Each structure stands twice: as structure tokens, then as C-alpha cells.
Design a protein around this nucleic acid. Structure first.
Lengths: 114, 101, 98, 206, 55, 95, 161, 79, 127
RNA sequence: GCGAAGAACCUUACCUGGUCUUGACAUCCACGGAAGUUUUCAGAGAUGAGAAUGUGCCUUCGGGAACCGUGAGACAGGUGC
RNA sequence: GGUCCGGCCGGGAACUCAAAGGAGACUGCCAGUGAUAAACUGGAGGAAGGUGGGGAUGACGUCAAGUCAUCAUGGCCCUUACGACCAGGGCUACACACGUGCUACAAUGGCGCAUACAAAGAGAAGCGACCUCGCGAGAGCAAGCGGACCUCAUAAAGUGCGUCGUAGUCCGGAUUGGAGUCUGCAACUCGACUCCAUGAAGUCGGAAUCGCUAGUAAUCGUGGAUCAGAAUGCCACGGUGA
């Protein structure tokens, strides 16, 4: 119950249980078990350590927690350093993709202060 | 509705039938995957800017042909939704009548 | 072998032009497979009825396309030219197939 | 502005269509457009001919305009030349050739287009609209219409407020679908603006 | 969309009962036919007692 | 009670919105609990007219007042609304 | 309505058991226009009502139902300023439907894992005179029997049957 | 994230760059073609993209290559 | 010999051929249980064969098409009663009483204009 | 979730700039030219400059047409109130 | 009869169906009530019984309601500009307020596998099989069809099996990053979709408020118009079904 830095659930099935890693979801999580020879419905208590070490270097291929967080921070901070339109929206907290801003915009905005 | 706009529509019909469907080979034949993907293809997507911009079929608005009204058109009739009621109740569009089921 | 399909807007006019061709193909030759009806196309057109606002006031319409088959089984040369020079009742459109 | 058009509500039941051509969906729009332009053109040109209604048919890449008028002598003119004078300009703006006909009405006091053109022209030359609007009702009822209703609308004598009047006499059942009602509407462009005239003429039940 | 409820017979009753209770000591707003006036007045006199039993 | 000003051909200035709002608030406090109020200002070449729609627990109630200077029309509309409110209020007291 | 003693239609009986009361009960918790899974909830609940009760299923449901069917029901009326509730007797068509609505609501509460387990336990306590719908039954009888002093004019339940 | 094959430029921007690069680093290039990409032989230039009422100059930097010219010239001004 | 009844219900039409035979019911070259006989309301095809007797008396060859599950089911329920035409008004006089011969002509309504799904109106609300 | 049965350009009517004036659209007068077609330069394009190609319908023949340019206005135009 | 048991093939015109013509439902019959009246209540027969269900149909008028931006038109105003052409932008801005909707907050469910059943419609610079390549949006080749034939086009909810065990969870799918596809000269402002990742609010909504009486409400999918591309809207159609 320690891969990629954390991986601590138990009593869960394996392909759902790997998805607490920041960088994996239900497709890459099936790619890990299908690429590491593990059936998808086993539990983390039911894995033996001679499988779990073969899953640690397996998930060491795709980018995980820290490298992905400083990577996405490099992307957003890069755009804000260029000062393009997208990064100009990132510097101000408004929708980047071109959503409606007259009415909703409220996930990127936050709560409503007035 | 603004004779300027009405003549602008038939200008775009004229150039849209003049250039393309004769020089649609610049994209439908050249801009394809083949053994010709060198700078002939870049010469093609380079070339379509030389053509008049008002020659593409997607600058058409497909207006009514009694009023030129831009909104509320019917491709079957060629008339806007006002004039087709005006001619439908008159008895012009053949076979057309009020529907109820 | 001749497949005569004809479509019109009025049922009481296409059933007139059909009797104007069964008496042809039975007047000369024989072996016609009946005035076969086909399903009616029902193009429906809903339009706004005011020149402005009042969206909910509409006007629903339809045209009717009635179709009939003929199916001459064995053609005679009086029959294939009997189809010619007889194409009246404008409102009915006819197609022959071989 | 709340009634159904009483010619259009009964188009399969009583009245015939003004166009009896089949066109498939590729040529229906243009086949209706030139159909419009010969009606605008003949309506503009034969304005003195007292035209009732023109019926356009398209047999086999040709056209037939049956011209319903009251005075066919002004239509055919001297010797029948003006028919061909119309037929050349019809064939120029339609699919060549053209077989135009005349189907005159011998009772023009019962046609709703000619009553409305009568009241229209008399309001254009500034007659009293009670005299014209009432004289149309008289001339239909002493000639054999089962009902009539004339309505004029607008300035009607240079008033600053528009109003309508209507002078029905007899039965005009607008809801009975088998009831034969010739409705038509014409417009009189007076120097105070537009005066709209619409006339219902009820004739029979089948 | 269906047919009338208790075809004025014992509706004529409860009209005379409501009109009996809410004053109207006229007994002069009934129907005029006999089979409905009889029990408009029937509900009226059944409503006088129900006025004595309360305020 | 929030109040919603709109104007057809009448440019709603900030001094105009302050006064109308004050008058409406005063009326709301005096007669009944009011949920929402829509105000419409129209000018038709002579007549400065005003419409108001109050949404109150019983329901909608509306009034309209024509005036000379817009302010007069607003005052008339507010008095009319107050009168309507008195009727609605004890119309649903009616003990 | 003002008019219309309406032309009434009947219902289809239940397939697995000879009952129309049970089919009405399926139509009560038939949420969202979907009859089949409501039938699976009802059958799955009467099975464990049989195993958790011993006796048969139709009598299990009916004995579990007659401890929540009511007799008197309040009707709120206002005269002048007061707005007191007046006890009307429930008519025996409305009676069992008004029971089953309370069973089904009290099963939509109470939350266990599954709906058949919730409704099975709720019918079990309805046999035990213990659960929620018997508390609502006794609330209705306490307030109608508490407001029992009103038997009057004409706006409710004319002479007899 | 569009236009599968080849970047987009106009001939009046491509020929205007290939004219004004071999002719030395010069005056800022007024451009109206906002919709065109930024090629790596445009690095080091002051091009003035038209935003609707200005021609705002932006120095082309190395990171700006995959973008378009209108991306670095805002149109609407807020506060 | 062989007897026929048509039957249709809610945009769904059956063809029922009844014969004096076993107690087997075939629907669209399938059996009843493997067509819908554990699905929603399988009782309504054996139901008109309950007020009359059917046990090993008459086999049924049914081809229903169009509509959905209960539309085909009520279609077959009407088709069987129509196919009890050689078994006369001794049976159909006692088969009027429990229904089974009304077509039950309730079709889905058309969507009216302005309304969202033929009765639902788009909520003019004060809140 | 109204005109709008579908605003990237067009639509588009609004804004900033770049241009035209009997005009983008219609008629009347005169003078030239077949119309049309391939290509270059400049410019954001409109536009302006060109480079070649092209020539029947009736003999009245500077034409009768269709079409294109310049000129004078009568006007045209206006989604302006 | 034949069968690669596929209406597949000879064949058949019964049945579904197509859609032209007819029949049928009118208080027609019976019993009671009623002024012997109109009518009402109940019954029979019948597919339907009391204007069968639904639609179309909107009286005289009101609101000097809406539209001079569909059009037409009286008057007024501009006519080297309020007219005309082009590029770029804006119509998509956002401290906020209101209206109409979609998706949820889950176990009557989510996910995975297998599998059953519709009606209506559209299609020629258009709809686009099959077969290869791609995880996929899609790409290449390319038949067929101006269509009861060909294509869009696998209906979905449902059903059987397995798992999840009541948690912000295997709920929810917002936002954002990367990589693409298609359309169109051209997806930056500002398109749709796909893939990987990210995983917000939300645990059923105070005061106030709306629709709905039966194939209705409520849910589930499908199609059309407008359209190069762009429906959570509109207009239609069926499924389940109180």
C-alpha cells in the first residue's frame, strides 16, 4: 500500500484503488494492471509484495504526483509569463476556454462576495 | 431589405460559382494525403489566400428572394416565413395546406 | 418489364391519371400489375406566424406526395409508344423505368 | 388580426390552387420564383384589364397562364396581338414556351378581386367610401350573391385616427368549411396613406 | 370532462342547507320545479335545527 | 423586496434610481411584506408613464400612472400601489 | 371537480398473487414511470417478510396493512379567524391507499441498504405496531380524536352510505 | 488545437516577413492578420498586431511560436 | 382447422393463429418465456385463455410487431380474443364482461405547439 | 431558449481605420469596346497599375442586340425618425 | 415445394401493411324521471355512447397592446454622406440582479459484459454501406440511393449476470493542463467533438412559486428544420407509464 508516494487505500478493488494517485484515472489504471499482469478486481490486501513492487515501477512510467503538479504549474506559470489571452485569464481568475461570463462563470470565480 | 445587401448576395453567388467548383482542386485534390505532400500542398494552402475571399460557398446567407430577409428561411421554398405564409394562404405553393393530426 | 412510378399532390387527380394509363396498357397489350399505391410523403412545415415577437403563435403545414406504380409485365411496341405522346394532367409527374 | 385566411383554410375542400405543377425538391423553389415573377409582372402590366385571378400550370417543361379577367377584349386587344405580346415576355422570364389563355368571368360583381379593385380605384380618385363601400354591397345583392362583407380600413378621408368600417348584408359564414367564400384584399394608395380594402363574397354551400 | 354531479336533486338539498344556515329566512330563493323545491325547503328546515344547535 | 428598474426611452439616471428606490422602500415598509417589485418607465412623446408590478404573497398586483415629468407619474403610481396594498392586506386578514 | 362523477377505470391484478391491492401497492412506489423494478422490490420484500414473519405473504402484507389503515382523518377548515381541523371518517377506498402511501414514504425514510430491505423492515414493524407509519397513524387518530368536538354542516360526507 | 496539417499564415505576412528579415531588423510591421501563426523565423521582430482600433507592438519571443498573432493582442479593455 | 384473430394495441399489431393442439405458445419463432414470459406483465397473454380453458387444448402461433413490450402484450391479448371467433358468443358474450374486446384506442398524443410534451407548459412563475 | 428555424468571416444593422462618388442595385443620353479568359506588381483588402488572349448574331452597317468602361443630370439609395 | 433454414428462392393474395373508396355512432333501441316537451339517469348491442380522443377553426370589440428592422406606405430628415466597398474588432465584455432550461446530489443507483422491443422523418455540390487504419473523434478506398429497396441507424429506459455497501464514495463532470480530429480562406478573441489527466459546488434546496385529470404527469431514447461546422432551445415521434 505504498506506490508512487502514497497509494494507501485497502478493502477496495485494485483498478479503483490505484486512482488515488494524482495522475491516474480509470483508463490508465486499467493500463497499469493489464500491463503488469494483475486481475482488476483484487484487493490491495490481497496483493503480495512481489506484485506490488512490480506495480511501483509500472506506475513509474506514467507521470505521477509531484512531477505532474510542478509540470502543470510550469504550464500555467509559463502562460502567465507570456501574458497571452489564456494566461491573461489565468492571472485574473476568469474562464479560459471562452465560457459565458455575463451570467454563470462561477466555478472559476468562486463564491459570490456581494 | 437594403438593395446593397441584396446585390452583395448575388455578387457572392457570381464569384462563388466562378472560382470554386472549378478551382476546388486546390483543396479537394491537392490538400490530401498522397505521395505529393511536399511544398505543393503548402503551395496550395498558400494559394487559397490569393483567390478572392468572397468566392467560398460559405459566405452565402441564402436569403429570401422576395425580401432578402436574412433570418427565418426555408430551403425548400426560397421564401422567408412571412412570405411563404402570404403565398400559402393565397394558394401559390401547390399542394401546401394547413396541417392537423 | 416497364416500371411506371408517378407522384402528384392530389389523390383525386393522381387516381385520375392512373386510370388514364391502365386503359392505355390494357387497351393495347395486356399483363399490368395493378394501380399499386405507395406510402405518402408528408413534408411538414411549421413557421412563425407573426412578423416579430409572439413565438408561441405558429402555423403548421404539410404537402402530400402521393405515389402510384403500374408495372407493365410484358411490353408491346404499341405500349411503349402508347406511353409516348400521352403525358397529360399537369400536376402529375411520371417516370418510366426499364 | 386574429382570423384565419378564408381562402387558405379551404384549399383542398372547396377552392382550387392557383398553381397546379409538381416539382421535386431540387427545382421547387425556382419553379415557384418564376411563378411569382410572372404574377407580379402580369399584375403590374394588366392593371387596366380588370384581372380576376391567374392560374399557372407547368405541363412538361412548358407553362400555361390562364388569365381570369372581366374584360377580355382589353386583354387580347386588336386581333389577338396583345396575347402574344404578353406571351413573349412570359416566355422570357419563365421556361420557354408559354400557352396563355383567357377565362373571363361574365359576372364581375361577384368576384372579390374586382370588387376590391373597384373600391380601390374609386378611393384613389377620391369618392365617398360609404358610397363606394355601400354600392358594392348593393351591386352584389341585386345580382345574386348570397352574402357579402366589405371592410375598409385606415385614414379614409384624411382623419388623424385610423378606423375600419364594414357593411355586411346576408350570410357570410366564415367557419363553415364547405361554404364557398371568395375572399380577396386590395390596397388603395391615397395621398393620406394606405387604405386597406378586404371583401368576402359568399356564394353557396357545395 | 364528464356529467353533472347528483343531478340537482341532492344538490338542491345542500343549496337549501347552506342557504338555510347562512340566514336567508326568506325560504324564497328556491328552484321552481317540485322535485328540487321540495328539498331545497327540506335542506332549509334541516338547517334551521343546525342553527339552533350552534350560535 | 428587491426592486428592478427598467426604462423604455427613459434614461434612468442615478438620481432617478435613488428617489424611486426610496419611495418604494417606504411603501413596502408601511403596508405589507413584499417579495419583489418591477418598475417600468415609458415615454411616448408627451406622456411620462410608469408601470409597477408587485409580487406579494397573495399574488401579483399592478398599477400604472401617467404624469408630466416622470417624477409625478412615479408618485401617482406609488400612491395607487399603496391603495391596492391596503385592499390586499386586509382582504387576507378578514377575521 | 364541480361536475363529473367520472367514468372510472379498473386496474390489472398482480401476476404472482391474486391481488389488485398489491398492484395498487406496486403503483404507489412505482417511481419515475417504471413498473418492473418496483415489482422486483415488492416481491423481494414480501419474500423476506415471509421469512422474517413465518406466515404467508398476502396475509403478511394485509395484517401488516391493517395496523396502519386509519379510521378518522382531519380536514382543515377555516371559519372567520380560526382554522380548526374537523374529523371526517375516511372512506374505505381512500383508507388502504392512505395506509400504503404512509408505508411507502416511511420506507423511503428509515434508510437501510436496499429498498426491499427498508420496505421489508417497515412492513415488519407495521406488523409489530412499532415503526413509523403506526406513529403517523396514531398522530392522525390523536388529532382527529382530539378535535372530535366538530360534527357539522354540509361540506363533508352526506348522510350515510 | 485545430488545423491538422500545416500552420496558417497569409501571403501578405509570409512574404512580408521574408522580405523584411533579409532586409534587416527594421520598423514595426503593421499586421491585420491576427489569425496567423508565429513562425520561428519571426523571432526578434516588433510586429504591431491590429486589435480593432490600435496596432499594438509585441516583441516576438521564442516561446510564442506555437500560438497565433491575435493571441498576444487583446481587444476588449476591462477597467 | 386453423383460426385467425388480428388484434392491435398502442402502435403495435399482432397476428394470432390458434389451432386445436397442445398448450404451447410461439411468438415470432420464440417461446413465450424466452420472449417476455419473465418480463413485464406476462400474464396478459395467458389472461384471455383463463376465462376460457386452454390447458392442452389449443396451440398458438403469434407474430406481433411494432411497439414495445406491453404494447405487444396488449396487442396479443386483443388478438387472442379476436381469434376466439369460432368459439362463439357463448364465449365472447362472457368475454365482453371482463374487457378483452375493446381495442383500447388510447394512443400517445401529439406534441402541441408552445407546450413542451402536450400538457406541460413552460412555467410562467413568480419565483 | 423572444424577432434569431442556428453572430468565427459572411450574417451585421455597431465600432476603429482605409477608400468611392450618378454611385453596390434600376432606367433615360452620349462616346468607345465583343463579352469573356490566363498571369504579374503594390496594398489589410477594397482598389490602382499592367501584361497576353478574345471577336457572331444584321447590313440599316458611327450598328440591332447582350455585356463592359467614362461623362452630365433627372435620380438612385437609407435596417434613419 | 426447395433451403448456404436467410422471406432466402419458386410461389400465394389470406394476414400485417400501404391508401383510395365505402360502412359505422345518430340519444338510433330499451327502462325509469320529467310540463304528454327539450332533456336527464341507467341498461343492451357495439371497436367506440352521449360534442368517442386530439387538432384546425378566435364572433362584436378592448388594450391609441407589438411590428415603419419581413414588406408596403403618408409625412419628415441625409444625399461627396445617416448612402456604397474592404480589413480587423464587437455582438461572446462582467463587481452584480432577474427569467427559462440541462445535469446532478445517488443503491427505484453507478460501472462492466450479454441481450429484447419502436414510431416518425431526412438525403444529390447530399445521405453515405461494406472492408482496412486509428484507443477514439475519424481517415482511405468505395458500392447503393432522388429512395416502402440504399444510407443516416447500434433506439434507450428494460432484461440476465457480476461488482460497488452509504462514503463527497466506483456519486456528481464543473473547471483546468496536455494531445488530437472535422468543418471552412480562416476555430486567438469565439465552433463542435475525441483521448489522457484534473475532480468544484452539490448529501434533495428558507420565504415565495409552477405544470398536470390518462396514454396525461414523470422518466427514456429517436428524428427534422435553420445549417459549411455549431442544440441543454424549438418543432415532431415513439417506449415505459402512475
Amino acid at each position: 500500500a505504498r506506490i508512487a508516494g502514497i497509494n494507501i487505500p485497502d478493502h477496495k478493488h485494485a483498478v479503483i484503488a490505484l486512482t488515488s494517485i494524482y495522475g491516474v484515472g480509470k483508463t490508465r489504471s486499467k493500463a497499469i494492471l493489464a500491463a503488469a499482469g494483475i486481475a482488476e478486481d483484487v484487493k490491495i490486501s490481497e496483493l503480495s509484495e512481489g506484485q506490488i513492487d512490480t506495480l511501483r515501477d509500472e506506475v513509474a512510467k506514467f507521470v505521477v504526483e509531484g512531477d505532474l503538479r510542478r509540470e502543470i504549474s510550469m504550464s500555467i506559470k509559463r502562460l502567465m509569463d507570456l501574458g497571452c489571452y489564456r494566461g491573461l485569464r489565468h492571472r485574473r481568475g476568469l474562464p479560459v476556454r471562452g465560457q459565458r461570463t455575463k451570467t454563470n462563470a462561477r466555478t472559476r470565480k468562486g463564491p459570490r462576495k456581494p | 431589405a437594403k438593395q446593397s445587401m441584396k446585390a452583395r448576395e448575388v455578387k457572392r453567388v457570381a464569384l462563388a460559382d466562378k472560382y470554386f467548383a472549378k478551382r476546388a482542386e486546390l483543396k479537394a485534390i491537392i490538400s490530401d494525403v498522397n505521395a505529393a505532400s511536399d511544398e505543393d500542398r503548402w503551395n496550395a494552402v498558400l494559394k487559397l489566400q490569393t483567390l478572392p475571399r468572397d468566392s467560398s460557398p460559405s459566405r452565402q446567407r441564402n436569403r429570401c428572394r422576395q425580401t432578402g430577409r436574412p433570418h427565418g428561411f426555408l430551403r425548400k421554398f426560397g421564401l422567408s416565413r412571412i412570405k411563404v405564409r402570404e403565398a400559402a394562404m393565397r394558394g401559390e405553393i401547390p399542394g401546401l395546406k394547413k396541417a392537423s393530426w | 418489364r416497364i416500371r411506371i412510378r408517378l407522384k402528384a399532390f392530389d389523390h383525386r387527380l393522381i387516381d385520375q391519371a392512373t386510370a388514364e394509363i391502365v386503359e392505355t396498357a390494357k387497351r393495347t397489350g395486356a399483363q399490368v400489375r395493378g394501380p399499386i399505391p405507395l406510402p405518402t410523403r408528408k413534408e411538414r412545415f411549421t413557421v412563425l406566424i407573426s412578423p416579430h415577437v409572439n413565438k408561441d403563435a405558429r402555423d403548421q403545414y404539410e404537402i402530400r406526395t402521393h405515389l402510384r406504380l403500374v408495372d407493365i409485365v410484358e411490353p408491346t411496341e404499341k405500349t411503349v409508344d402508347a406511353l409516348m405522346r400521352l403525358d397529360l394532367a399537369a400536376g402529375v409527374d411520371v417516370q418510366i423505368s426499364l | 388580426g386574429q382570423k384565419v385566411h378564408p381562402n387558405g383554410i379551404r384549399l383542398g375542400i372547396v377552392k382550387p390552387w392557383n398553381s397546379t405543377w409538381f416539382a421535386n425538391t431540387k427545382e421547387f423553389a425556382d419553379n415557384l420564383d418564376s411563378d411569382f415573377k410572372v404574377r407580379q409582372y402580369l399584375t403590374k402590366e394588366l392593371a387596366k384589364a380588370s384581372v380576376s385571378r391567374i392560374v399557372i400550370e407547368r405541363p412538361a417543361k412548358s407553362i400555361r397562364v390562364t388569365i381570369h379577367t372581366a374584360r377580355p377584349g382589353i386583354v387580347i386587344g386588336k386581333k389577338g396581338e396583345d396575347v402574344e405580346k404578353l406571351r413573349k415576355v412570359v416566355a422570357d422570364i419563365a421556361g420557354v414556351p408559354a400557352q396563355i389563355n383567357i377565362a373571363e368571368v361574365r359576372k364581375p360583381e361577384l368576384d372579390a378581386k374586382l370588387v376590391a379593385d373597384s373600391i380601390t380605384s374609386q378611393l384613389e380618385r377620391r369618392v365617398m367610401f360609404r358610397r363606394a363601400m355601400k354600392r358594392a354591397v348593393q351591386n352584389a345583392m341585386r345580382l345574386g350573391a348570397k352574402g357579402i362583407k366589405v371592410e375598409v380600413s385606415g385614414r379614409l378621408g384624411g382623419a388623424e385616427i385610423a378606423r375600419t368600417e364594414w357593411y355586411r348584408e346576408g350570410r357570410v359564414p366564415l367557419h363553415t368549411l364547405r361554404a364557398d367564400i371568395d375572399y380577396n384584399t386590395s390596397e388603395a394608395h391615397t395621398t393620406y396613406g394606405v387604405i386597406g380594402v378586404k371583401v368576402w363574397i359568399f356564394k353557396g354551400e357545395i | 370532462m364528464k356529467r353533472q354531479k347528483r343531478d340537482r336533486l341532492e344538490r338542491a338539498h345542500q343549496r337549501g342547507y347552506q342557504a338555510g344556515i347562512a340566514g336567508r329566512s326568506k325560504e324564497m330563493c328556491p328552484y321552481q320545479t317540485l322535485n328540487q323545491r321540495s328539498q331545497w325547503l327540506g335542506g332549509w328546515r334541516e338547517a334551521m335545527a343546525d342553527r339552533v344547535v350552534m350560535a | 423586496m428587491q426592486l428592478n428598474i427598467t426604462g423604455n426611452n427613459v434614461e434612468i439616471t442615478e438620481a432617478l434610481r435613488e428617489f424611486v428606490t426610496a419611495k418604494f422602500a417606504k411603501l413596502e415598509q408601511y403596508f405589507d411584506r413584499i417579495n419583489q417589485v418591477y418598475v417600468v418607465l415609458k415615454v411616448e412623446k408627451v406622456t411620462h408613464t410608469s408601470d409597477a408590478t408587485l409580487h406579494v404573497d397573495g399574488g401579483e398586483l399592478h398599477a400604472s400612472a401617467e404624469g408630466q415629468d416622470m417624477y409625478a407619474a412615479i408618485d401617482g403610481l406609488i400612491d395607487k400601489l399603496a391603495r391596492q396594498l391596503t385592499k390586499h392586506k386586509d382582504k387576507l386578514k378578514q377575521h | 371537480p364541480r361536475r363529473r362523477v367520472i367514468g372510472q377505470r379498473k386496474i390489472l391484478p398482480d401476476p404472482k398473487f391474486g391481488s389488485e391491492l398489491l398492484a395498487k401497492f406496486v403503483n404507489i412506489l412505482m417511481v419515475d414511470g417504471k413498473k418492473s423494478t418496483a415489482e422486483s422490490i415488492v416481491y423481494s420484500a414480501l419474500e423476506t417478510l415471509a421469512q422474517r414473519s413465518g406466515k404467508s405473504e398476502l396475509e403478511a402484507f394485509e395484517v401488516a396493512l391493517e395496523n396502519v389503515r386509519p379510521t378518522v382523518e382531519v380536514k382543515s377548515r377555516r371559519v372567520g379567524g380560526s382554522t380548526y381541523q374537523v374529523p371526517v371518517e375516511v372512506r374505505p377506498v381512500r383508507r388502504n391507499a392512505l395506509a400504503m402511501r404512509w408505508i411507502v414514504e416511511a420506507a423511503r425514510k428509515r434508510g437501510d441498504k436496499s429498498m426491499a430491505l427498508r420496505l421489508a423492515n417497515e412492513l415488519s414493524d407495521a406488523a409489530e405496531n412499532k415503526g413509523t407509519a403506526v406513529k403517523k397513524r396514531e398522530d392522525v387518530h390523536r388529532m382527529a380524536e382530539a378535535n372530535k368536538a366538530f360534527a357539522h354542516y354540509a361540506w363533508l360526507s352526506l348522510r350515510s352510505a | 488545437r485545430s488545423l491538422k496539417k500545416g500552420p496558417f499564415i497569409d501571403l501578405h505576412l509570409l512574404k512580408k516577413v521574408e522580405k523584411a528579415v533579409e532586409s534587416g531588423d527594421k520598423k514595426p510591421l503593421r499586421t491585420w492578420s491576427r489569425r496567423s501563426t508565429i513562425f520561428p523565423n519571426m523571432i526578434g521582430l516588433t510586429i504591431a498586431v491590429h486589435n480593432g482600433r490600435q496596432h499594438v507592438p509585441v516583441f516576438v519571443t521564442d516561446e510564442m511560436v506555437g500560438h497565433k498573432l491575435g493571441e498576444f493582442a487583446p481587444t476588449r479593455t476591462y477597467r | 382447422n386453423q383460426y385467425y384473430g388480428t388484434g392491435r394495441r398502442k402502435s403495435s399489431a399482432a397476428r394470432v393463429f390458434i389451432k386445436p393442439g397442445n398448450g404451447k405458445i410461439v411468438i415470432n419463432q420464440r417461446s413465450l418465456e424466452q420472449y417476455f414470459g419473465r418480463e413485464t406483465a406476462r400474464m396478459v397473454v395467458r389472461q384471455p385463455l383463463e376465462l376460457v380453458d386452454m390447458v392442452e387444448k389449443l396451440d398458438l402461433y403469434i407474430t406481433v410487431k411494432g411497439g414495445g413490450i406491453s404494447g405487444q402484450a396488449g396487442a396479443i391479448r386483443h388478438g387472442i380474443t379476436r381469434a376466439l371467433m369460432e368459439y362463439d358468443e357463448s364465449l365472447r358474450s362472457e368475454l365482453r364482461k371482463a374487457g378483452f374486446v375493446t381495442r383500447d384506442a388510447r394512443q400517445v398524443e401529439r406534441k402541441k405547439v408552445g407546450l413542451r410534451k402536450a400538457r406541460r407548459r413552460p412555467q410562467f412563475s413568480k419565483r
